[PDB]
Design a protein around this ligand. Structure first.
Ligand SMILES: CCCCCCCCCCCCCCCCCC(=O)OC[C@H](COP(=O)([O-])OCC(O)COP(=O)([O-])OC[C@@H](COC(=O)CCCCCCCCCCCCCCCCC)OC(=O)CCCCCCCCCCCCCCCCC)OC(=O)CCCCCCCCCCCCCCCCC
Ligand SMILES: CCCCCCCCCCCCCCCCCC(=O)OC[C@H](COP(=O)([O-])OCC[N+](C)(C)C)OC(=O)CCCCCCCCCCCCCCCCC
Ligand SMILES: CCCCCCCCCCCCCCCCCC(=O)OC[C@H](COP(=O)([O-])OCC[N+](C)(C)C)OC(=O)CCCCCCCCCCCCCCCCC
Ligand code: SF4
Ligand code: SF4
Ligand code: SF4
Lengths: 70, 318, 176, 357, 55, 88, 155, 96
């Protein structure tokens, strides 16, 4: 037979699964069901501080839209 | 918050490294017509635990000719490097989104050779010293092709951001565009990772153990695990580079399944490739590298820089 | 009759050079090597599951000396000492003495397991098929002393096995 | 530049004890001389002794000798080719056809009763008879062993790694090779046109047909191919002898050199004495000396057996086929890389039982 | 023997040979381990007459 | 910070599990120098990806390819005058 | 209880060591080839721990296979001291056990006991390949009946 | 037995959980096969003891021992010959 290596393979897939879901789900939990807003250039950065400072709770992820302005 | 993600990344990486010893002795055997570790643990699920436990309970020998200061920094310098190298890997959304991640991965890859260099000096034996001397010279000679292959590949991709890899490689695998460089890249991975036909040091009889000639259980855990640790990732780096998957923002599960399967399959080929080829002699390594691999890589970099200019296909860095 | 080996000539035509150039650039014989191992991966293993599975042997197997006994009960060895003379390693040590009944019987029969070689000469020596090499190999030890066998151990080995080795010489004495 | 292959690390004064023992007790020494091709050593000793004794083995024994001589021939190049690859650093092509050795290794258990040191071929024929049905099993093994060697050649010969690491390495000119005392694969691989069976036909080897795979250049690779082609030629010799099995006895019909049958052992007085004396001191070998030499699957194996005329040998100097072969390590490694040294050893298949006595 | 069809064609293709025709493990072609009594022949000179050791 | 935290945690894990494993129980020069010169020449064309998006990429084409042929030229002179065929 | 705690630790350490030995080959004669068949798939040993890591420094048990010579005597010995503990030596075959077929010879020391402390003896000339697998297995059970942490607790 | 399986593996066993006082559950060993089944298991013949009982004799062991080494039931070499040089046993009482 040959499939006796499959359970050795399968446990690895479980181990490598943890980083993929964790760093994704932790992103969802730390962004409130969203993803971490990437900032590869200055614009993507001061955009966050614009959103972080307006939220009032000093969190960029929470966003206030049309219900905020009049 | 952040720290719980750190253990959630490195810890499963470390536990996977211990298990890779099992398949190294098992899938080789199932190709060698052997059985592989089966008696201990159900289907050999517990052999890596047995392997790792004596290495952390056997006597740690410090030869009198070995500088204890150098004897301890090197295994830490190796294992830690492998773990921190994982932080920019683009697992759906990478833990570290370094816009220069490609350079970041390559930079500390060069830092790896200090692990063998210092160990060869720390061991301080005639045969041991030359074994490391003509081991480091191999790894450095393979980094120049490593950089050139990288430089050509992301030239068509865009910037050096490792997250951009999944964006450029949207519809077609990048291998279909740089397959002459893919095998150029793959063999380069086979040499930096110190595996046959470039096992060389860790060769069970090439250099008996090379970097582990006098270096036995105890601190040797952080010097025979690190090489296997780079194996899973440098193949995974190839998986991101040429075999990129799809990532749905509403379901990152698909890309986790696809990438892990792709990198696990590549590691099978990596374990496949040890059990099918002899070991290159030292002169043959440089002859293959400088005089056949090095010129071809330069020509392909010639081609891959003009082609976006040829077809107005320059990629957006932002 | 004879035959060369390395007398193949490489063809210089456009076709032949193309295959060689393709082989060098696009590694094909390397892939051929890969295919050979991979086809063997899907080949069933031949790993005997010791101790539960045990390797095959033949009714002629040689090991673990053991004196036998006649169907009446008296031991076979009449101290004819051909085994002692034959023994190419001189592992046998036999001292004779006239037993109270009158017939011979060895008062000392030590065969040093770690001088013996299991060549099977000793059974061919004594015409009464007194000493034979049994089918045992499972007598590895942890002290050097217990390997040094004596008359008492040899008889105990004989009484222990006997029945197994009884059929062995029954199916092999025709060949001898 | 300069190489000194120091030896003695296994040395046993083999012929020193040979003097004190008689011929029959001397036979297990030969099986332990080359621990790779064991029964081939038995062949050399038995030929030498029965050459002095002026007694020829029965035809049934002779056709057994080539069948087992080629069985040992199958063993050694598996030992030689695979570990030479293991010397280079190839693991799996070593193991695959290593398993096939347990097939006729099991055959050895069927005949002699032991596995390695058979003690089967003796002066005056062969000790025991072939067990019933074993010849069919030999055919079963032979019919499939050709496949495994196609697996070896495909894995090793064509691959560029095997060539570039081993070809053009350790070349040796024909005149230098022969004048160095080399033999067998050392000569035939390096252009020299000579094989013991074809030229000096001992035993029934003349009747069987085969080819001698000599080489053109004579490096480690050429020797490696010479070994694997002899393997195919060994299969040919196995095919012919196995189909040439005669009706005949296994040992000479001379009770002064051959033990009488166990049925006759316990039936007749002459048989009782003849086995008794043959198993006390052995047989009286007429004085003289000889150098009966046959090709071992590694090289030329011979013995200088000089007998005083008693029941025990006087002096038996054993030709070591690797004795001269290991002497060439100086030049075959000269002008070559360090890794080529083990390649020289691997293609020589240096076995530390003969070069060290 | 053992294996299934789709596996056989997989290893048949990867090796370029028909392994099912002849394999390297014995299944049923092995001769029966127990065998009839082997009545051995006699010596060429086994004769009650004109066989003196003078010859 | 996060970068410093990641590397710091890796060192402690390596340090921690090292401690439990210690208390609980001219050719050689030429390959170095040739790599050094090639590696330094390699660093020149590392900024190539963004340089490929310059507004005068025609001049980039002449000169980015310039360094690459010099890489070949340096090897070519090295190869022909022995060089990569290291002393043996 | 304390004795239970030291018993569980003893089992955990013993089970690891017995199940994953890393033997280093010291074959010198025909005793090497037959053990080397244990590497062959017929009696695979890598099924349980014993693997190709070799590297005499990274070795638990040493198998001394073949005849031992006086000129081989010191070089083999210095290997044994350099071998880190727990070090056990396996005596392979009649020659390494007590000299065997060359007991009365000038270039062989009778047995490996005169050189190294032999923990296990495997008779044979050569011992059958599977018989050594038994010898390794009985050595494995020998480790199972070890009370290192138990004997420390009594102290 | 499994005749469909390939040679060698075609016959296999699992041992008793209680072998002569000492348990064999994680104490697997090859030295518990009795003389009767030492043949059939090893493919030394095709005649299982259930279908071919061994020749019954009085001196044969009625209970097959394992490898007694390690246990206090080991073997110790000792001279089985008798001393042949006796002393003078000097007589007592008087003085010269
Ligand atoms: C990866 C590929 C898909 C999964 C594996 C598929 C597989 O094994 O198929 C059976 C079989 C295994 O290989 P084979 O050489 O044909 O087997 C020959 C004998 O039948 C083999 O004879 P046998 O006696 O081994 O047959 C019984 C065997 C049958 O075993 C199976 O069928 C394997 C799946 C068991 C669940 O089951 C056992 O022996 C019981 C123990 C099982 C050990 C653990 C198996 C883990 C499987 C993976 C788990 C998840 C990871 O393969 C096929 O039939 C075709 C190849 C696979 C095709 C997959 C679909 C595409
Ligand atoms: C419009 C088209 C534009 C592009 C066209 C480009 C040209 C056409 C394509 C050319 C071929 C592709 C590029 C070159 C590749 C070969 C490079 C080379 O040096 O080859 C010769 C080299 C050297 O061969 P050599 O040493 O025998 O000969 C070289 C020439 N002399 C002698 C003068 C020096 O071959 C190798 O390096 C062999 C492989 C070594 C590593 C061992 C493992 C191999 C594993 C193979 C199977 C797995 C593959 C995995 C692939 C990746 C998967 C993700
Ligand atoms: C389930 C698992 C499915 C996949 C299993 C593995 C597939 C890959 C390995 C086996 C491939 C076929 C084996 C075979 O026939 O080999 C001999 C054959 C022929 O080998 P050859 O050496 O006889 O070459 C004959 C042809 N001439 C003479 C012209 C050179 O191999 C091939 O045909 C290989 C072709 C593809 C090679 C690609 C190499 C470069 C890859 C770059 C990255 C992509
Ligand atoms: S088998 Fe040979 S060496 Fe062993 S006791 Fe019998 S005759 Fe002596
Ligand atoms: S040869 Fe046989 S009968 Fe003679 S002493 Fe030895 S065991 Fe007894
Ligand atoms: S015990 Fe026998 S097989 Fe082992 S080395 Fe000595 S003679 Fe050779």
């Amino acid at each position: 037979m040959w499939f006796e290596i499959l359970p050795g393979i399968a446990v690895m897939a479980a181990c490598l699964f943890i980083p993929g879901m964790a760093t994704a789900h932790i992103h969802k939990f730390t962004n409130g069901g969203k993803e971490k807003r990437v900032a590869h250039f200055s614009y993507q950065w001061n955009l966050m501080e614009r959103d972080r400072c307006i939220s009032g709770v000093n969190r960029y992820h929470v966003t206030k839209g049309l219900e905020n302005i009049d | 918050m952040f720290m719980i993600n750190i253990l959630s990344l490195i810890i499963p990486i470390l536990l996977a490294v211990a298990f890779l010893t099992l398949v190294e002795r098992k899938v080789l055997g199932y190709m060698q017509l052997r059985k592989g570790p089966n008696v201990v643990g159900p289907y050999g699920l517990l052999q890596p635990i047995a392997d790792a436990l004596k290495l952390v309970t056997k006597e740690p020998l410090r030869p009198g000719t070995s500088s204890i200061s150098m004897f301890i920094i090197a295994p830490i310098l190796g294992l830690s490097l492998a773990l921190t190298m994982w932080v920019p890997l683009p697992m759906p959304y990478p833990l570290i989104n370094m816009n220069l991640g490609v350079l970041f991965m390559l930079a500390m890859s060069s830092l790896a050779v200090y692990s063998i260099l210092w160990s060869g000096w720390a061991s301080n034996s005639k045969y041991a010293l030359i074994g490391a001397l003509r081991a480091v010279a191999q790894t450095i000679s393979y980094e120049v092709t490593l950089a050139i292959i990288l430089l050509s590949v992301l030239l068509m991709n865009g910037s050096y951001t490792l997250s951009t890899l999944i964006t450029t490689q949207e519809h077609i695998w990048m291998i279909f565009t740089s397959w002459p460089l893919a095998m150029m890249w793959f063999i380069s991975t086979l040499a930096e990772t110190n595996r046959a036909p470039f096992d060389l040091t860790e060769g069970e009889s090439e250099l008996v153990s090379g970097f582990n000639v006098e270096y036995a259980a105890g601190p040797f855990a952080m010097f025979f695990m690190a090489e296997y640790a780079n194996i899973i990732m440098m193949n995974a780096f190839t998986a991101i580079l040429f075999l990129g998957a799809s990532h749905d923002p509403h379901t990152p599960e698909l890309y986790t399944i696809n990438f892990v399967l792709k990198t696990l399959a590549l590691t099978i080929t990596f374990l496949w490739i040890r059990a099918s080829y002899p070991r290159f002699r030292y002169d043959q390594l440089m002859h293959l590298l400088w005089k056949s691999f090095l010129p071809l890589t330069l020509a392909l970099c010639m081609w891959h820089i003009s082609l976006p200019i040829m077809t107005a296909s320059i990629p957006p860095q932002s | 009759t004879y035959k060369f080996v390395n007398m193949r000539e490489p063809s210089m035509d456009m076709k032949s050079v193309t295959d060689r150039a393709a082989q060098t650039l696009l590694w094909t014989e390397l892939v051929r090597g890969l295919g050979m191992t991979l086809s063997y991966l899907f080949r069933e293993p031949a790993t005997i599951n010791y101790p539960f599975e045990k390797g095959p042997l033949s009714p002629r197997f040689r090991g673990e000396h053991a004196l036998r006994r006649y169907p009446s009960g008296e031991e076979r060895c009449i101290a004819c000492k051909l085994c002692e003379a034959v023994c190419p390693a001189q592992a046998i040590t036999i001292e004779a003495e006239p037993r109270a009944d009158g017939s011979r019987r060895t008062t000392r029969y030590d065969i040093d397991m770690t001088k013996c070689i299991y060549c099977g000469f000793c059974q061919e020596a004594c015409p009464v098929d007194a000493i034979v090499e049994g089918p045992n190999f499972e007598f590895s030890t942890e002290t050097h002393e217990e390997l040094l066998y004596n008359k008492e151990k040899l008889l105990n080995n004989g009484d222990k096995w006997e029945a197994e080795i009884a059929a062995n010489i029954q199916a092999d004495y025709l060949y001898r | 530049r300069k190489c000194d292959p120091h030896i003695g690390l296994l040395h046993r004064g083999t012929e020193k004890l040979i003097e004190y023992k008689t011929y029959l007790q001397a036979l297990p020494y030969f099986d332990r001389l080359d621990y790779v091709s064991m029964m081939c050593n038995e062949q050399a000793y038995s030929l030498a002794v029965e050459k002095l004794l002026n007694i020829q083995p029965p035809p049934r024994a002779q056709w057994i000798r080539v069948l087992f001589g080629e069985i040992t021939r199958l063993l050694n190049h598996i030992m030689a080719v695979t570990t030479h690859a293991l010397d280079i650093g190839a693991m799996t092509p070593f193991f695959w056809m290593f398993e096939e050795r347990e097939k006729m290794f099991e055959f050895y258990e069927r005949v002699s009763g032991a596995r390695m040191h058979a003690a089967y071929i003796r002066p005056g024929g062969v000790h025991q008879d072939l067990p019933l049905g074993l010849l069919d099993d030999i055919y079963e093994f032979s019919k499939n062993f050709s496949f495994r060697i196609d697996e070896l050649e495909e894995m090793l010969t064509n691959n560029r790694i095997w060539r570039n690491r081993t070809v053009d390495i350790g070349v040796v000119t024909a005149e230098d090779a022969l004048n160095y005392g080399f033999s067998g694969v050392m000569l035939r691989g390096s252009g020299i046109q000579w094989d013991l069976r074809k030229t000096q036909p001992y035993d029934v080897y003349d009747q069987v047909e085969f080819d001698v795979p000599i080489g053109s250049r004579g490096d480690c690779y050429d020797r490696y191919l010479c070994r694997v082609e002899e393997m195919r030629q060994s299969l040919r010799i196995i095919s012919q002898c196995l189909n040439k099995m005669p009706p005949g006895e296994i040992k000479v019909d001379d009770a002064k050199v051959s033990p009488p049958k166990r049925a006759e052992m316990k039936t007749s007085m002459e048989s009782l004495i003849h086995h008794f004396k043959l198993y006390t001191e052995g047989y009286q070998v007429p004085p003289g000396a000889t150098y009966t030499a046959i090709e071992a699957p590694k090289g030329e194996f011979g013995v200088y057996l000089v007998s005083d005329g008693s029941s025990r040998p006087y002096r038996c100097k054993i030709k070591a086929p690797g004795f001269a072969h290991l002497a060439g390590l100086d030049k075959m490694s000269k002008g070559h890389m360090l890794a080529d040294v083990v390649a020289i050893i691997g293609t020589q298949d240096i076995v530390f039982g003969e070069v060290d006595r | 023997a053992s294996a299934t069809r789709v596996i056989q064609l997989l290893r048949n293709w990867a090796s370029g040979r028909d392994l099912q025709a002849k394999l390297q493990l014995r299944y049923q072609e092995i001769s029966k381990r127990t065998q009839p009594p082997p009545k051995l022949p006699v010596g060429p000179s086994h004769k009650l007459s004109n066989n003196y050791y003078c010859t | 910070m996060n970068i410093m935290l990641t590397l710091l945690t890796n060192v402690t894990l390596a340090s921690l599990l090292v401690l439990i494993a210690f208390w609980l129980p001219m050719k050689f020069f030429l390959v170095a120098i040739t790599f050094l010169l090639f590696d330094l020449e390699i660093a020149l064309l590392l900024p190539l990806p963004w340089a490929s998006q310059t507004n005068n990429l025609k001049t980039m084409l002449t000169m980015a390819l310039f360094l690459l042929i010099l890489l070949a030229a340096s090897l070519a002179y090295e190869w022909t005058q022995k060089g990569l065929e290291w002393a043996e | 209880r304390g004795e239970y705690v030291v018993a569980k630790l003893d089992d955990l350490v013993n089970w690891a060591r017995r199940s994953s030995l890393w033997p280093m080959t010291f074959g010198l004669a025909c005793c090497a080839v037959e053990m080397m068949h244990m590497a062959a798939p017929r009696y695979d040993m890598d099924r349980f721990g014993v693997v190709f890591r070799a590297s005499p420094r990274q070795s638990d048990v040493m198998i001394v296979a073949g005849t031992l010579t006086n000129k081989m005597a010191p070089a083999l010995r210095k290997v044994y001291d350099q071998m880190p503990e727990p070090r056990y030596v396996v005596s392979m075959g009649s020659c390494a056990n007590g000299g065997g077929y060359y007991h009365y010879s000038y270039s062989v020391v009778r047995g490996c006991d005169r050189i190294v402390p032999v923990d296990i003896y495997v008779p044979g000339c050569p011992p059958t390949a599977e018989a050594l697998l038994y010898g390794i297995l009985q050595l494995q059970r020998k480790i199972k009946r070890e009370k290192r942490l138990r004997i420390w607790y009594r102290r | 037995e499994d005749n469909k399986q390939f040679f060698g593996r075609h016959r296999w066993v699992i041992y008793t959980t209680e072998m002569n006082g000492r348990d064999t559950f994680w104490d697997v060993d090859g030295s518990m096969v009795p003389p009767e089944w030492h043949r059939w298991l090893h493919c030394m013949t095709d005649d299982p003891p259930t279908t071919k009982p061994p020749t019954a004799r009085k001196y044969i062991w009625t209970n097959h021992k394992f490898n007694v080494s390690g246990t206090p039931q080991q073997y110790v070499p000792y001279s089985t010959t008798r001393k042949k040089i006796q002393e003078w046993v000097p007589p007592s009482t008087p003085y010269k």
